[PDB]
């Protein structure tokens, strides 16, 4: 019974680890998208009015 409870706790820890990994990956993707938006804004700031 103790071994079964330990296996259940291991499965719960694996589920929590998968959830945490997914959340961290989603946050990293959000940060990468925000950095890409900032880079697009910077590229738009490159537009100026010089001579030919």
């Amino acid at each position: 019974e103790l071994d079964a409870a330990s296996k259940v706790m291991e499965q719960e820890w694996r589920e929590k680890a998968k959830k945490d990994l997914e959340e961290w990956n989603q946050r990293q993707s959000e940060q990468v998208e925000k950095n890409k938006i900032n880079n697009r804004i910077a590229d738009k700031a490159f537009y100026q009015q010089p001579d030919a």
Binding site: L2, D3, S6, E10
Partner: protein, 73 residues
Amino acid sequence: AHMGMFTELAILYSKFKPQKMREHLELFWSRVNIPKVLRAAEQAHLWAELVFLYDKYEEYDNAIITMMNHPTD
């Protein structure tokens, strides 16, 4: 108060009252035969006591092995 008495006490505690075996170890770890109590804790599925005895005996390799074999206990 030879080491054999505490060794046999720790051996016979695992089979009946494992909840007090940890308390007895935390008091008489220096007076218990190492491999006998290790095998007793292995048969009694007392992984925390195994890790405690490994840490008190500076056996880090077997400690880490037992910890990895039981990530939640």
